[PDB]
């Protein structure tokens, strides 16, 4: 694998990773509004 | 009183004792078959036929069986062909159980791990009658798998890092498909080629050369590897001699 | 960018995708096992 | 790959395929044709043999008749496979040792499935077709007939099974040890004894006092493997027919103190 | 007495320890320092087993039994009349097995062959140790080792396997059974093929690797090879022993419940849980 | 006759006879496993 | 297999299969006369 | 119609025959299993 | 093995599959006349 | 239109037919399992 | 095989998939008129 | 677009089809197992 | 293996995956209309 | 600060990530095994 | 293994392990606020 | 410092890491077993 190939893989790979993390964060936010998963002192 | 034969005997016990009799006979037969090579036993010192045996010696050794070979020859087992009593070694003690000490160079004298059996001076033959083990030059049809690394052209190195030579050919087996021997061109005395067993050689993986490491012997022992009469075929006796010489490295390499 | 110099980008992609899918499947099965987060046969909070 | 079936192979495959289809269809019908329930209970599904009241005759299809048909077809397929492996060895101008070693396993299979039920008069205690059903048949057989541990032929079968494992662990290890001397060419060593066979025999002699040859070790292995199933089949046949309680038999014959 | 080809191999050297002192043969047996230790431990253990038989109630060989100390003793060494004899015999047997393996290593060194045979015997030693040392140690008492008796160790096997409702449902025990049956089947096939090639019938010529491969290809569809079969057999036997060790480690040290009840997870899977 | 140029007559006949014999045996066993059609243990209709 | 051999084998095969089917049909007719195998509205 | 140049005629016909027979046997077994269509048992309707 | 033979195969295959399907349809008609397999709202 | 250059038409058709047959058999088995859609037994609605 | 054979293959594949999907849709329409498979709020 | 030069579009498509079919089958089996979403055996909402 | 053909492969792959995702979204909307799969705090 | 001459970088990075992942999984399962730190089930302080 | 490329590893490896440890410390701090894992004399 | 020539400076590090990690795991599991030092359950003194 050449240097330019590695750099291209890198930039579009982090470009695809940012979208993946954004989608995961949005889904987890929706799940949190649905039902939070961190119990309180007394519990749920 | 379901299975009772007598007051105490019953059918299960009778069948068990019948099996015991049969198993004793089977052990006798299996030992008979075990004694088809190397027997009768010889005296440790004199070499005359003498051993501590009982009344079962009549049944101990079976009549020689004949193996019919595709070449027309026959091999008898037991053949009663003993090795020479005198060997190039001397016992450390006069007792029968004492070990032997090599007189000179054990690797060349072929004693201990360097010893080999006096097999027939004939190469192994395939179904078609052609010699089984030939170099890749004589067998253009065969080829090494593309997923594997061709040992040809790879340096041959020993356990201490000394380079013994380079692989110039591979000796294959046509009967059972496998690589048997590696033809190595020695660095010292250029033009001299020695056979190298495949089973005693491991590839060193990621070395950027995949050096074919030989843990058996050192670099200086490659010059004394037994030679072969023909350049395209190897007899059984020469085969054994080469494997025996290589197998003795673990014991006589540092001596 | 040198991570792709060490590792085959194709193999890295395949392994990362397989690992992510297996982890997602495991977490989903764990959530289904739990009573609170079982969204199919949902139970009251 | 290059599998030679022939007429005997075609027969055996057809018979065994019919038996497999019958067994699988019965298993799937037992869960009312549910693929989900079939996957859920696949281990627990089984095709039970007919009850004792039907004797050796044909039971109704829903009450063991399918088991009888499948068992007969499987037995015919296995016997035809034995004939196949006999004829292949004969065609290749070789010995029938493989066929006669398979004969011992066939003897044990028939003793478990057909011969013992024939002696007892009914198929009630035959082995059902199913993983957990046949494990439970094993457990219930031992429990009903005293303790199988106390069956001397079960003792011998276990001894020969352990001996088969021990002998293969010895033989494979020895051949790998002498593999650097051409030991893997066993028939070539038998025909022309080499340093590999010599060193293997000498190692075992120096270890345990006695040794075998490159052919006689295979004779030992063959006989151990055959005797495992042969002694086991003898024990199965003698169980219940002549000995109703193996623990009581052992107590009578000194294997255990009297309760 | 020597074979017809033994004198040239009976050479000096190859000992791991002891030097020339023990480099000698008594009859066919190679002695070695580890052989001297093997004889020491074998005589000690056999004499103590006979002593336990004398202490016992019967002289019947089947009913002779040396029992481990009670579970109440824990891992503490017990009095010789209350399981201490069993502990001494256990450790003497362990020493004898280790010395036998090292003697085999010395013989391998002398003959210039591989160590696969002592390596494989190491698995049998490991299984024995797991049964008498590792499992009782992780279980908390020496009383969980099997008694040294012809029948009482079978009774121990039965009781231990029925403590978990049904031992047939142990997942690693199923794999051990599968590999044990496969080892016997493969041994029968290998011996049969080698004997059929070496003995092709009266009036016939000995066959070779071609015929050996062709026979099993034609019959079952594929072959393994000349050394592949031995490697497969060794791996099968060792894997059977390893999975037996695993099932015994799981049964009581890790899992204490019913093995038949352990299988409810399969019926509780989400795609079938109705 | 076109069919016999493709299929070897020996193999075709051997396969057909095996299949027909197995089918006939299965049908006879099925009939024997029924109350109505069991001729060796005949009952009322 | 020659054309003539194939034709003659086809002729023999047709004759044999016709005879086999005729025998099977006669056996089935006898079995149906003895006991029919198609239940009516109220069974057998 | 040129399908037989793609698929071997012999193997195609043999596999089709095997598959059709397997399907027919399975359907007949299902009919035997059911109560209404069990012609051998002959339940009332 | 040739296209010219493929013409004749396809012809005979069409004829044979038509015969097979006609026999199947006739048998299905007979079975439907005997006992239909589509239940009404209230079962059979 | 370029699929028959990329994929082998001989293998693709066989795989598709096997997949479709397996899916149809699975769905029919599930329907037979269900009470409402078991056409052979015919439970009342 | 070749490009023209691929043209013909695509034509026949489209026609056969159309007939397959049409038969499937007609069968599903018949099954829906016999017994629908979408339960209501209370059940069927 | 770059994906298809490193990943063969003959193996990627087959893997995608098999994985998607397996996932769809798994989800459908889960829905059949659950009580609320079992459309073949309709229960109360 | 070649850039132009891989680019047009991406074009047709996007044209297919968009249709697949649209069909899946429509099916999920219909299933949500039938029976929603997100229980409330009191359950279903 | 030159460990990477001794150990192969690829094997080191494929052996240190697996170790960390396995340790994280083990610690998460251990937390699930305790009443206090089980965030899925949920209990009092 | 070249010394310069090895040093470049060392540098980026150090940066990445520092990021990993910072994230782990943040997570452990959040868990400490949630529920501390060090009991007192009276327990939890 | 010559012990690093005596022993492989790679196998030494690997063995030391594997020994220290296993010792740490054993000690931590022993502490978890003990009631006083079980930080997860957190028993009172
Ligand atoms: C109401 C319930 C009922 C009922 C009382 C009843 C009776 C019986 N039924 Mg049935 N059946 C019922 C219903 C019903 N039934 C079928 C049919 C049939 C068929 C077709 C089989 C088939 O397709 O084979 C498909 C097979 C084909 C066409 C090919 C032949 C198969 C072979 C060679 C096997 C392959 C193996 C090899 C080794 C290859 C050889 C090698 C070489 C040539 C080189 C048929 C011969 C047949 C047999 C009987 C029997 C024995 C019984 C018994 C025991 O009572 N049944 C009809 C048909 O012709 O369908 C195409 C049809 O439509 C229909 C309906 C509705
Ligand atoms: C029931 C609701 C629930 C639930 C309790 C839960 C827990 C958490 N999920 Mg989520 N998640 C839930 C549902 C669910 N989830 C996802 C997945 C994924 C991915 C995405 C991949 C990725 O690269 O993420 C990117 C990864 C990142 C963002 C790594 C950053 C990690 C950090 C800064 C440290 C984490 C620790 C804390 C903040 C401690 C604070 C706790 C307290 C105060 C009490 C992934 C690793 C991940 C992380 C986590 C985290 C950090 C948490 C915490 C601590 O809340 N979750 C799975 C997936 O896509 O796998 C490929 C998947 O399918 C699936 C499902 C069903
Ligand atoms: C409560 C349970 C229990 C118990 C406590 C206990 C104890 C132990 N026992 Mg025992 N046993 C119990 C019961 C019990 N015991 C067995 C037998 C044995 C064997 C099997 C040998 C073999 O190779 O079988 C295996 C060989 C067979 C069964 C025959 C080979 C089969 C062939 C050729 C057929 C070919 C197949 C096809 C073409 C595929 C067809 C397809 C389809 C059907 C779908 C054996 C050696 C053995 C081992 C152990 C040990 C080591 C222990 C320990 C450590 O506890 N026991 C008996 C027998 O006779 O074995 C020959 C027998 O039948 C029987 C019973 C009921
Ligand atoms: C409820 C009763 C029950 C039950 C229903 C059921 C069923 C079956 N099970 Mg099981 N089993 C039950 C009980 C139960 N099960 C066993 C074990 C197993 C194994 C291990 C075999 C092995 O690898 O031995 C490995 C052997 C060892 C221990 C090797 C040690 C030997 C050494 C170092 C050498 C010693 C040398 C000398 C002393 C010197 C000799 C000197 C001279 C001759 C001069 C295994 C594969 C196996 C076989 C079967 C089968 C085939 C069946 C059938 C037929 O259903 N079972 C476990 C074990 O030992 O695991 C290591 C164990 O303890 C235990 C229990 C409690
Ligand atoms: C010495 C005792 C040991 C032993 C030995 C042994 N077993 C043996 C042999 C030997 C020596 C063989 O030679 C023989 C063999 O071939 O081994 C590879 C065998 C064998 N023992 C086997 C297994 C086996 N061995 C076992 C064990 C043992 N057998 C003992 C440990 C065990 C158990 C329970 O432990 C099992 C399960 C088989 C693998 C094999 C015998 C194979 C056999 O008989 O097959 C019968 C045929 C069929 C079932 C046909 C199946 C057809 C399929 C449905 C395919 C489709 C065909 C086609 C489509 C049909 C036509 C359709 C049309 C009609 C529509
Ligand atoms: C690991 C794979 C298989 C295996 C392999 C294996 N075993 C081996 C070897 C190998 C490769 C040898 O090289 C070695 C050998 O030389 O065999 C001839 C051996 C061997 N394994 C043996 C037996 C054996 N192997 C067994 C099993 C197995 N070993 C596995 C199935 C079994 C069982 C139970 O299945 C037995 C019984 C011997 C033939 C031999 C061991 C020789 C030895 O240890 O010699 C030194 C010891 C003595 C001469 C006697 C010691 C006596 C003690 C002082 C007392 C021990 C008491 C004991 C604890 C209980 C006795 C009562 C029982 C009834 C419970
Ligand atoms: C390539 O094909 C291969 C072959 O090859 C061609 C083969 O062959 C084989 C091998 C296989 C076979 C031969 C088939 C048979 C094998 C089996 C069926 C496996 C089962 C095996 C058995 C049942 C046999 C078990 C017998 C054993 C374990 C031997 C027992 C030996 C001893 C107890 C003593 C060991 C010897 C020692 C330590 C020294 C010698 C001891 C004496 C002679 C007696 C005591 C001596 C004295 C008193 C004097 C010396 C005393 C001393 C030094 C002081 C000690 C002080 C005390 C008093 C204690 C294989 C595998 C192979 O694949
Ligand atoms: C000198 O050296 C010698 C050779 O060399 C020259 C040799 O060669 C051999 C011969 C030895 C071998 C070829 C292998 C030996 C190794 C073993 C026995 C262990 C491995 C076990 C197996 C793979 C079993 C092999 C047994 C077979 C193939 C028997 C054949 C029987 C039939 C064709 C009859 C019909 C088949 C039936 C009914 C089942 C047969 C059993 C299997 C095929 C395996 C079981 C499979 C299932 C039931 C489900 C799994 C389905 C599969 C595998 C397909 C889907 C894919 C999956 C992965 C699930 C010897 C002995 C030898 O001495
Ligand atoms: C060579 O390159 C060329 C020139 C050809 C250019 C071409 C480039 C192309 C085409 C590139 C393709 C790029 C793509 C599609 C990239 C996709 C990247 C993605 C999606 C990356 C995602 C990464 C995710 C990571 C790293 C996530 C890791 C998460 C971990 C390790 C989480 C662990 C969580 C645990 C252990 C939690 C456990 C909790 C429980 C309770 C389950 O534990 C028991
Ligand atoms: C395509 O279709 C598929 C392949 C999907 C169908 C699926 C098939 C499946 C899943 C098949 C296998 C299922 C399972 C789980 C099989 C497991 C079988 C096991 C483990 C069996 C174990 C033991 C059984 C034994 C030993 C039984 C032996 C029985 C015998 C020998 C019976 C003989 C009976 C005779 C000779 C009957 C005589 C009476 C007659 C018929 C002559 O007169 C009344
Ligand atoms: Fe020999």
What's the total helix number of chain A? 1
Ligands in the model, by name, code or SMILES, are: Trans-Geranyl BACTERIOCHLOROPHYLL A, bacteriopheophytin A, ubiquinone-10, spirilloxanthin, fe (iii) ion
Distance between the termini of chain B: 75 Å
Gap from first CA to last CA of chain A: 53 Å
Largest sheet data of chain A: none
Task: Explain the overall architecture.
- This is part of a larger assembly, with six copies of chain A (44 residues), one copy of chain B (255 residues), seven copies of chain C (45 residues), one copy of chain D (259 residues) and one copy of chain E (274 residues).
- Chain A is 73% helix and 0% strand.
- By secondary structure, chain A is an all-alpha fold.
- Chain A is rod-shaped and about 60 Å long.
- Chain B is α+β, with helices and mostly antiparallel strands.
- Chain B starts with 10 loop residues before the first helix and ends with a helix.
- Chain E is an all-alpha fold and 274 residues long.
- In chain E, helix 1 (32-55) runs antiparallel to helix 2 (84-111), helix 2 (84-111) packs antiparallel against helix 3 and helix 3 runs parallel beside helix 7.
- The interface between J and K is small, with 8 and 10 residues.
- One spirilloxanthin sits between chains A (1, 5, 8-9, 12-13, 16-17, 20) and C (9, 13, 16, 20, 26-27, 30).
């Amino acid at each position: 694998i050449t240097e330019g190939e590695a750099k291209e893989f890198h930039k579009i790979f982090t470009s695809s990773i940012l979208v993946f993390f954004g989608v995961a964060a949005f889904a987890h936010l929706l799940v949190w509004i649905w039902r939070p998963w961190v119990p309180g002192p007394n519990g749920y | 009183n379901k299975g009772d034969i007598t007051g105490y005997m019953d059918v299960a016990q009778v069948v068990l004792y019948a099996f015991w009799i049969f198993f004793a006979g089977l052990i006798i037969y299996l030992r008979r078959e075990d004694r088809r090579e190397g027997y009768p036993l010889e005296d440790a010192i004199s070499g005359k036929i003498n051993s501590l045996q009982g009344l079962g010696s009549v049944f101990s050794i079976a009549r020689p069986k004949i193996f019919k070979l595709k070449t027309g020859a026959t091999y008898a087992a037991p053949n009663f062909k003993r090795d020479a009593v005198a060997i190039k070694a001397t016992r450390t003690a006069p007792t029968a159980g004492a070990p032997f000490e090599p007189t000179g160079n054990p690797m060349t004298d072929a004693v201990g791990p360097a010893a080999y059996a006096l097999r027939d001076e004939l190469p192994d033959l395939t179904l078609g009658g052609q010699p089984a083990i030939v170099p890749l030059r004589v067998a253009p049809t065969f080829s090494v798998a593309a997923e594997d690394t061709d040992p040809r052209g790879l340096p041959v190195v020993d356990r201490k890092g000394a380079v013994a030579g380079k692989v110039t050919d591979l000796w294959i087996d046509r009967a059972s498909i496998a690589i048997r021997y590696l033809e190595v061109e020695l660095a010292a005395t250029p033009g001299r080629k020695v056979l190298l067993p495949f089973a005693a050689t491991r590839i060193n993986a990621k070395t950027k050369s995949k050096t074919v490491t030989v843990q058996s012997i050192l670099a200086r022992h490659f010059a004394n590897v037994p030679t072969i009469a023909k350049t395209d075929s190897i007899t059984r006796r020469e085969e054994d001699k080469v494997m025996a010489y290589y197998s003795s490295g673990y014991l006589y390499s540092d001596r | 960018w040198r991570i792709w110099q060490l590792f085959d980008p194709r193999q890295a992609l395949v392994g990362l995708a397989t690992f992510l899918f297996v982890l997602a499947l495991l977490i989903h099965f764990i959530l289904l096992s739990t009573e609170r987060f079982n969204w199919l046969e949902g139970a009251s909070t | 790959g290059p599998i030679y079936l022939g007429t005997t192979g075609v027969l055996s495959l057809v018979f065994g395929f019919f038996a497999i289809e019958i067994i699988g269809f019965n298993l799937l019908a037992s869960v009312n044709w549910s693929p989900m329930e079939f996957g859920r209970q696949f281990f627990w599904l089984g095709l039970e043999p007919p009850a004792a009241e039907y004797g050796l005759g044909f039971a109704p299809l829903a009450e063991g008749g399918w088991w009888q048909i499948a068992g007969f077809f499987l037995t015919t397929s296995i016997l035809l496979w034995w004939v196949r492996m006999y004829r292949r060895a004969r065609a290749l101008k070789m010995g029938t040792h493989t066929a006669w070693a398979f004969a011992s396993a066939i003897f044990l299979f028939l003793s478990l499935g057909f011969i013992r039920p024939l002696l007892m008069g009914n198929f009630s205690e035959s082995v059902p077709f199913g993983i957990f059903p046949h494990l439970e048949w094993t457990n219930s057989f031992s429990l009903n007939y005293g303790n199988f541990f106390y069956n001397p032929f079960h003792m011998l079968s276990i001894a020969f099974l352990y001996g088969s494992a021990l002998l293969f662990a010895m033989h494979g290890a020895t051949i790998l040890a002498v593999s650097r001397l051409g030991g893997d060419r066993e028939v070539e060593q038998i025909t022309d004894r080499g340093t590999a066979a010599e060193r293997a025999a000498l190692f075992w002699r120096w270890t345990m006092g006695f040794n075998a040859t490159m052919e006689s070790i295979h004779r030992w292995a063959w006989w151990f493997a055959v005797l495992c199933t042969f002694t086991g089949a003898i024990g199965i046949l003698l169980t219940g027919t002549v000995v109703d309680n193996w623990f009581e038999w052992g107590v009578k014959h000194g294997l255990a103190p009297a309760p | 007495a020597l074979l017809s080809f033994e004198r040239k191999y009976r050479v000096r050297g190859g000992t791991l320890i002891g030097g020339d002192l023990f480099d000698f043969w008594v009859g066919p047996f190679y002695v070695g320092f580890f052989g001297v230790t093997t004889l020491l431990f074998t005589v000690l253990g056999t004499a103590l087993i006979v002593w336990g038989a004398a202490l016992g109630p019967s002289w019947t060989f089947w009913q002779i039994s040396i029992n481990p100390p009670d579970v109440s003793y824990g891992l503490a060494m017990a009095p010789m009349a209350k399981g201490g004899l069993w502990q001494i015999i256990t450790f003497s047997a362990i020493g004898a097995f280790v010395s036998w393996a090292l003697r085999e290593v010395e013989i391998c060194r002398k003959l210039g062959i591989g160590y696969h045979i002592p390596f494989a015997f190491g698995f049998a030693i490991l299984a024995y140790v797991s049964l008498v040392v590792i499992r009782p140690v992780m279980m908390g008492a020496w009383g969980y080792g099997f008694p040294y008796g012809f029948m009482t160790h079978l009774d121990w096997v039965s009781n231990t396997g029925y403590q978990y409702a049904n031992f047939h449902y142990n997942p690693a025990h199923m794999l051990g059974i599968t590999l044990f049956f496969t080892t016997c089947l493969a041994l029968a096939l290998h011996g049969s093929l080698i004997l059929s090639a070496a003995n092709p019938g009266k009036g016939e010529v000995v066959k070779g690797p071609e015929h050996e491969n062709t026979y099993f290809q034609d019959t079952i569809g594929y072959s393994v090879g000349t050394l592949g079969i031995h490697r497969v057999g060794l791996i099968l036997a060792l894997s059977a022993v390893v999975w037996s060790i695993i099932c015994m480690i799981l049964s009581g040290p890790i899992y204490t419940g019913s093995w038949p009840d352990w299988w409810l997870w399969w019926q509780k899977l989400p795609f079938w849980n109705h």
